[PDB]
Amino acid sequence: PSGYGVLLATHDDDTVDVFTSGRKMRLTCSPNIDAASLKKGQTVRLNEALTVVEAGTFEAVGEISTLREILADGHRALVVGHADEERVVWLADPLIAEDLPDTRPRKLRPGDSLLVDTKAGYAFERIPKAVPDVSYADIGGLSRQIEQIRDAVELPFLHKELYREYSLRPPKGVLLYGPPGCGKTLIAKAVANSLAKKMAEVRGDDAHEAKSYFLNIKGPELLNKFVGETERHIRLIFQRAREKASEGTPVIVFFDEMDSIFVVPQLLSEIDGVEGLEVIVIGASNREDMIDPAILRPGRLDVKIKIERPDAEAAQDIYSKYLTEFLPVHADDLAEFDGDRSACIKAMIEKVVDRMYAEIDDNRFLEVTYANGDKEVMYFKDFNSGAMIQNVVDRAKKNAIKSVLETGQPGLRIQHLLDSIVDEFAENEDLPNTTNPDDWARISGKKGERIVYIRTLVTGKSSSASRAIDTE
Amino acid sequence: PSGYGVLLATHDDDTVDVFTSGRKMRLTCSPNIDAASLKKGQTVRLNEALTVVEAGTFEAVGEISTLREILADGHRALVVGHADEERVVWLADPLIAEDLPDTRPRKLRPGDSLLVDTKAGYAFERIPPDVSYADIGGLSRQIEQIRDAVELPFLHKELYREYSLRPPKGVLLYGPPGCGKTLIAKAVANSLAKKMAKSYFLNIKGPELLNKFVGETERHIRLIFQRAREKASEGTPVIVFFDEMDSIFVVPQLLSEIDGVEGLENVIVIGASNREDMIDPAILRPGRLDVKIKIERPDAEAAQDIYSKYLTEFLPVHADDLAEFDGDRSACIKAMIEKVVDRMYAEIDDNRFLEVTYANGDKEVMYFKDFNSGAMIQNVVDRAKKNAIKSVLETGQPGLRIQHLLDSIVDEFAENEDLPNTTNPDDWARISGKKGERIVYIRTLVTGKSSSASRAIDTE
């Protein structure tokens, strides 16, 4: 029958201060044990004669207090508990151990949760709780976009030496803005994949690959708490970034829906912290007006690259991307083009593109009434997007499969594609959620007048109904 | 086996007041230990016979309470925890030691976090600039107005005294963005940091007003000012810069804290704000921010002065441009600088920026020459340097040429037309004032040759 205690201080005369069942009783050590090998904060054992009889491990359960500061002497730890109370506690041997390098054992920094025992004023241990394949070629209709992206991202990280010679710092951030339906995540993944490839560990190809270095977070996951509230994870994400920074395979911090973010101030400091580092920050937004210019000033997000709506040629490129030679193009289409699938898919694509982008009454999208009484008719060519093209391709695929199930003939046709186009056009007319206030801002800037009324124009041959739209 | 205790008081009959376990008492002292050298708060140890046999050190861990009042006799401190409760505790010998001057202990004052023992009632230990006026271009009047109010009183205290003129306490920097307006504050804090005829450097920003991190931000306003007065009792100057006051303008703590440092002229309080409309006039009243200094949009000559900084003779100016000026680097750079500045400030239709429609029906067309800024100049310089780097890469020859800057100018203008965050309501205030009519509609215009699109501007 023997009790336990916590070692406080080791003295040369074999006497050891032990905190046990009260305030700091000092006892004597048994000859069996060595007082030199004992550790501060290590749970010790006491017999009935109040003599330290054996050593042991450290206490594993107790109160959890986050570490605020290490303060003076490097050992005593300033921690705060649940009630915002401030306490100074020693750090046990495992915490102050110099064998911990940079979930896994590590040193202690502010924000970490330490297992503490307030009775002994000790901290014992830390309790941690807590890549793209797409390339530039896989994204169609964004040539000048990817050119600017390369000149702003790839060019500095390769030609740092020329940048230093001309005294030009590498841009720290890339701002991507434009209507939805295209880019945002796609471009953000493509640029990082192209980066990781370009070099590809310049050395022996027989030991070098495309490698993997990427990271994605989104603006919506700010108010989400679960494990921890909004403010805390903003340091951890950039610590994750700097972890791969020195490894020579940098990742990119990507902000999706950054317009929804703007509390602001910590992001400024955390972005400025990676200034002297080459990791890039990419921001994506579908509405640029409310975005604070503080983060757009030179030095944080220097290159602002607009992801505009696709035109006719961009639509042709995206349809080439979405309509590969592996798709079952119908024999009726193939026969007209001498069985040449390459010249049949391309002719199919140009047919559907001209059908969509032709200014016809069936392609009328919406009517804008301005503050001066002017009414301007908008067409589906002015509101095309990669998402709309993808939806048309998928719905034409579904139409082709449904036609297969009924007629027995495999293949996708101009009939299927045009039916998909008109069906998706009617679907947008009935539910036009693609548009954003930036589209109305651009329309108002082009017109020269304010926008006071918007209504959708329906062809009248589908179940879609005309519906008014409010900008505010 | 021996006990431990905390020394409370020393008595002449060798008995010592000692706090240990429960039932605190006073004990007879062993002849080995001397009662004269014993000090308050020192943790002593006692044998089973309840006799103090050794005088040890002070307790190094415990509760942390922020000091509130250093109180009169014996300096027994009134301290508070975060539970909003006040406690009166004794101060140990090291805290009341008179050997400390103003990771090392200095003279204690309210706001310091002290390591206290609640049950004992004893506190043992306390728990804790390279830019000049020359680098800034195009702000000669602003730097002069700054120095006349900040440096001039400090150097000529006696002449200010002779005219019964009080030195102004703080300055107010206001105007449209793009010039930064923090460089001016740093330049004055540095040029005044070298007098001795380093002195000082410190900064803090308004945006971290709602941010908390360590502790709550409610009393941070008093902490920053006590850190400011720390060296204010030394004789070296202080300049408390407050960037982005327009975000702050709760208010009253700053008003009281600026008044609390009024009587000590050794401290300056500088403020910056991109829009002066909502700044509380109480902080602009004489005595708090006496002189108000406006950082406005640079003109053509200010642009040339700024470009002289960004385009130095050490930059690789192309040999094609060098040969035009007989290899003269300085003359070539001066000529290319004035060329690009004249290009930006030309009233050609390609230098058009925005269209504003007024409430009276008039529409005014205004150019990029009215929205030049240090940020736009620097972005043009950086893009021209990138164009030069690209040239070297695809053509072989080195050098930055006038064509690179001109292309950078037009690209930056197109980028501004597409993305109009360089404009603030401060600009529209001056525009509507000079027009004489309210502004109802602002929209971007595009020359049509770029990928930029016209966008309606609605600012607030």
Side-chain angles (χ1 to χ4, degrees), chain A residues 1-202 204 207 210 214-472, chain B:
Chain A
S2 293
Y4 287 87
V6 177
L7 185 142
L8 313 176
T10 58
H11 295 204
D12 62 333
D13 60 337
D14 301 342
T15 59
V16 166
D17 297 340
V18 179
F19 200 97
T20 178
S21 66
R23 179 257 196 273
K24 300 178 186 173
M25 294 298 102
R26 173 176 182 180
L27 314 176
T28 56
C29 280
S30 187
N32 175 37
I33 64 166
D34 198 343
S37 58
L38 285 170
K39 314 174 188 181
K40 296 173 60 181
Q42 161 188 35
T43 299
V44 302
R45 216 191 86 186
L46 312 173
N47 69 331
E48 202 177 12
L50 291 176
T51 69
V52 178
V53 286
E54 78 178 6
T57 62
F58 296 73
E59 276 201 299
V61 295
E63 203 198 38
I64 284 297
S65 178
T66 61
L67 176 57
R68 288 264 285 244
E69 277 169 359
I70 311 170
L71 57 87
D73 197 45
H75 284 191
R76 292 186 307 163
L78 182 61
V79 299
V80 292
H82 68 109
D84 291 331
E85 57 90 20
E86 308 182 353
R87 198 164 188 74
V88 160
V89 292
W90 295 98
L91 293 177
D93 199 3
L95 289 184
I96 55 159
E98 290 190 338
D99 306 312
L100 311 168
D102 292 332
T103 315
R104 298 312 149 194
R106 191 184 173 91
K107 59 176 181 180
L108 314 180
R109 45 194 166 196
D112 292 337
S113 299
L114 304 178
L115 161 79
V116 293
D117 202 352
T118 54
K119 62 94 174 179
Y122 279 172
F124 286 160
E125 59 187 358
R126 179 171 53 74
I127 315 296
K129 42 176 190 179
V131 294
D133 193 316
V134 58
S135 58
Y136 288 154
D138 303 344
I139 303 179
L142 288 178
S143 48
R144 61 91 173 175
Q145 277 89 3
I146 68 170
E147 192 271 347
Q148 297 192 4
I149 291 151
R150 291 168 85 172
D151 273 353
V153 166
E154 305 194 7
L155 193 71
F157 278 21
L158 276 182
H159 306 86
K160 277 174 292 183
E161 70 289 332
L162 207 47
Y163 273 54
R164 301 289 82 74
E165 179 165 42
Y166 276 78
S167 308
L168 162 66
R169 45 88 182 164
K172 300 304 167 286
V174 194
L175 164 69
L176 300 172
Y177 63 98
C182 51
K184 314 306 143 186
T185 57
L186 302 173
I187 292 182
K189 295 188 191 174
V191 56
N193 188 236
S194 184
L195 292 175
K197 279 168 180 168
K198 278 313 168 184
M199 296 84 65
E201 307 172 5
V202 186
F214 188 63
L215 188 149
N216 265 344
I217 62 171
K218 58 178 66 66
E221 310 167 344
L222 279 196
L223 60 84
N224 197 336
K225 299 161 52 60
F226 286 165
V227 64
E229 63 269 15
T230 306
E231 193 269 328
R232 311 298 289 166
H233 284 138
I234 310 158
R235 287 89 166 92
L236 276 74
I237 47 169
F238 281 96
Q239 292 163 270
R240 278 177 152 266
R242 59 87 185 169
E243 182 179 1
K244 250 52 189 177
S246 170
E247 195 257 327
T249 313
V251 305
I252 292 191
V253 180
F254 171 66
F255 292 134
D256 205 342
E257 288 93 6
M258 65 179 288
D259 49 348
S260 294
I261 307 193
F262 46 90
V263 188
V264 64
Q266 60 275 12
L267 282 81
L268 280 66
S269 63
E270 267 294 358
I271 289 160
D272 290 322
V274 65
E275 192 163 19
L277 196 148
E278 294 181 79
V279 165
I280 313 171
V281 65
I282 292 185
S285 172
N286 303 120
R287 170 62 166 170
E288 188 67 33
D289 279 327
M290 73 291 291
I291 305 192
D292 200 314
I295 199 167
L296 274 72
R297 292 296 91 194
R300 309 172 160 181
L301 279 73
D302 309 83
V303 297
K304 314 98 181 173
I305 301 182
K306 168 173 81 178
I307 318 306
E308 65 182 2
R309 298 204 104 97
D311 51 13
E313 52 181 4
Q316 292 180 356
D317 202 348
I318 302 171
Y319 267 103
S320 67
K321 290 311 145 66
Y322 277 106
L323 298 172
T324 45
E325 298 293 325
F326 295 161
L327 287 184
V329 159
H330 194 37
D332 283 283
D333 306 336
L334 291 160
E336 177 83 359
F337 299 125
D338 290 331
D340 186 20
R341 190 182 298 273
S342 68
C344 169
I345 298 179
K346 189 263 181 182
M348 201 46 38
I349 287 170
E350 59 166 282
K351 281 292 185 178
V352 305
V353 163
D354 67 56
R355 185 267 182 275
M356 294 182 286
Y357 284 67
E359 296 176 347
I360 63 178
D361 279 2
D362 303 274
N363 280 5
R364 297 177 297 171
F365 192 19
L366 59 90
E367 168 201 283
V368 165
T369 307
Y370 297 101
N372 64 319
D374 290 350
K375 302 197 183 252
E376 179 175 334
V377 182
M378 295 296 172
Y379 299 90
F380 273 101
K381 65 155 185 161
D382 277 317
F383 284 92
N384 199 331
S385 67
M388 183 293 267
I389 289 183
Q390 170 181 0
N391 169 283
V392 169
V393 167
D394 285 21
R395 186 192 317 276
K397 287 185 178 181
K398 192 223 64 180
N399 290 329
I401 295 157
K402 165 173 169 276
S403 173
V404 168
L405 283 181
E406 278 165 21
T407 63
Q409 274 161 292
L412 185 145
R413 294 186 68 185
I414 189 74
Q415 189 64 40
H416 301 160
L417 281 173
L418 303 183
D419 294 347
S420 180
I421 291 163
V422 66
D423 286 347
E424 164 64 8
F425 280 4
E427 198 165 295
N428 297 282
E429 285 171 2
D430 191 74
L431 189 52
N433 287 19
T434 305
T435 68
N436 283 140
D438 68 353
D439 296 332
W440 315 131
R442 299 290 177 88
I443 291 183
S444 161
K446 185 162 195 166
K447 171 63 186 177
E449 285 287 322
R450 216 166 321 109
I451 296 191
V452 306
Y453 176 75
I454 294 163
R455 80 164 156 149
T456 66
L457 312 180
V458 293
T459 177
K461 83 212 171 183
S462 309
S463 44
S464 64
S466 182
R467 166 209 293 263
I469 303 169
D470 51 350
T471 59
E472 282 60 60
Chain B
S2 298
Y4 264 78
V6 169
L7 192 145
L8 318 169
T10 64
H11 290 207
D12 57 342
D13 48 312
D14 291 333
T15 52
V16 55
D17 292 332
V18 164
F19 187 83
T20 182
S21 183
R23 182 50 183 155
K24 74 182 182 70
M25 73 291 291
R26 79 188 267 184
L27 307 156
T28 57
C29 195
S30 178
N32 178 27
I33 307 297
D34 169 46
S37 53
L38 281 175
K39 58 185 73 175
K40 298 170 62 178
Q42 172 186 34
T43 295
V44 304
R45 67 185 279 276
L46 60 85
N47 60 339
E48 185 178 1
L50 287 93
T51 309
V52 176
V53 301
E54 175 188 279
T57 67
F58 293 71
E59 291 161 349
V61 298
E63 203 269 337
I64 289 299
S65 293
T66 301
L67 165 75
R68 271 279 276 269
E69 293 179 354
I70 175 167
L71 189 150
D73 48 349
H75 295 285
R76 39 156 169 171
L78 194 150
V79 300
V80 290
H82 205 286
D84 290 17
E85 188 68 47
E86 319 197 328
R87 289 272 267 172
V88 166
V89 297
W90 297 112
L91 283 198
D93 202 351
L95 295 190
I96 60 171
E98 304 166 15
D99 299 337
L100 313 178
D102 288 330
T103 56
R104 57 154 294 267
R106 32 166 188 75
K107 284 327 279 169
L108 299 186
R109 268 164 208 191
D112 283 333
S113 293
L114 296 173
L115 177 74
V116 308
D117 195 303
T118 76
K119 66 181 178 67
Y122 286 89
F124 316 98
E125 205 176 14
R126 190 270 304 278
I127 297 298
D130 65 309
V131 69
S132 74
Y133 294 149
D135 311 333
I136 304 174
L139 296 184
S140 296
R141 70 168 188 84
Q142 288 89 349
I143 59 173
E144 161 196 293
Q145 288 197 38
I146 284 283
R147 51 165 53 179
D148 274 14
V150 183
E151 311 186 333
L152 178 72
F154 284 20
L155 291 180
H156 289 65
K157 291 180 179 180
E158 67 271 16
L159 195 42
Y160 269 63
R161 171 91 186 186
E162 269 193 271
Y163 280 82
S164 280
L165 173 55
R166 86 288 178 275
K169 179 60 179 67
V171 308
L172 177 65
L173 298 172
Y174 61 98
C179 290
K181 293 187 301 180
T182 313
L183 278 77
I184 298 94
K186 305 296 103 185
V188 54
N190 298 327
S191 169
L192 187 153
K194 299 289 94 176
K195 310 314 297 181
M196 290 79 66
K198 203 153 307 304
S199 283
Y200 162 79
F201 182 76
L202 185 147
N203 192 1
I204 190 167
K205 53 211 171 314
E208 300 187 353
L209 183 64
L210 297 175
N211 176 269
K212 295 157 153 53
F213 193 59
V214 293
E216 61 272 12
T217 181
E218 207 281 331
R219 283 303 102 200
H220 187 69
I221 311 298
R222 189 262 175 186
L223 268 294
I224 57 173
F225 270 95
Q226 78 178 98
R227 296 180 67 253
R229 58 84 179 168
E230 178 183 0
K231 76 182 75 70
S233 184
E234 180 182 0
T236 187
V238 188
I239 293 188
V240 186
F241 180 63
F242 285 154
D243 205 326
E244 193 71 22
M245 275 164 186
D246 47 354
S247 287
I248 302 184
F249 309 101
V250 176
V251 174
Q253 296 86 21
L254 281 73
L255 269 48
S256 73
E257 277 304 319
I258 285 170
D259 302 335
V261 71
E262 280 314 320
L264 190 147
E265 187 63 29
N266 199 4
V267 177
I268 300 305
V269 57
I270 296 191
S273 173
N274 290 265
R275 38 191 316 170
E276 52 271 25
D277 309 301
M278 73 291 291
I279 313 180
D280 201 325
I283 205 166
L284 281 71
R285 294 296 89 193
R288 293 175 169 166
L289 275 75
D290 302 280
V291 298
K292 276 74 66 180
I293 304 182
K294 166 168 108 176
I295 315 284
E296 71 201 325
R297 299 248 186 211
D299 69 326
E301 182 64 27
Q304 293 198 16
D305 187 25
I306 299 185
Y307 269 98
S308 55
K309 321 296 180 172
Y310 286 95
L311 303 180
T312 45
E313 303 190 34
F314 319 131
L315 294 186
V317 181
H318 191 34
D320 270 11
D321 286 339
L322 291 175
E324 180 66 28
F325 305 103
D326 186 74
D328 203 336
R329 182 77 64 189
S330 193
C332 177
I333 291 187
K334 185 177 179 181
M336 60 80 72
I337 282 177
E338 49 192 349
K339 220 79 192 186
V340 298
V341 167
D342 212 19
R343 172 58 183 79
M344 315 156 203
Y345 288 74
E347 276 202 50
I348 66 170
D349 283 18
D350 291 333
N351 273 7
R352 182 287 311 148
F353 187 28
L354 304 176
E355 163 170 301
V356 293
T357 311
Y358 300 107
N360 70 336
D362 192 1
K363 305 198 184 212
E364 174 177 344
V365 161
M366 61 155 177
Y367 292 166
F368 282 104
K369 66 182 177 66
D370 288 310
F371 281 95
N372 192 3
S373 57
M376 182 305 298
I377 288 188
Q378 174 183 347
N379 193 358
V380 159
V381 164
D382 290 20
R383 187 173 293 104
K385 290 184 174 183
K386 202 207 66 176
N387 295 345
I389 282 150
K390 290 186 305 183
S391 180
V392 184
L393 280 172
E394 280 92 7
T395 63
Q397 64 203 337
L400 187 146
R401 53 182 94 215
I402 185 76
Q403 290 77 15
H404 298 154
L405 279 166
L406 295 184
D407 301 337
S408 176
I409 292 177
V410 298
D411 293 337
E412 174 63 22
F413 282 178
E415 179 183 280
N416 275 289
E417 293 168 6
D418 195 30
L419 175 54
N421 296 115
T422 186
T423 74
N424 62 357
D426 211 0
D427 292 314
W428 321 121
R430 323 216 80 94
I431 295 174
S432 196
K434 68 172 70 68
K435 175 61 182 179
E437 189 67 27
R438 287 293 88 202
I439 306 181
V440 65
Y441 180 70
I442 309 157
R443 61 147 172 178
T444 64
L445 304 177
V446 289
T447 180
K449 257 51 186 173
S450 297
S451 295
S452 57
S454 286
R455 193 172 184 178
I457 298 173
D458 201 47
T459 47
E460 58 264 12

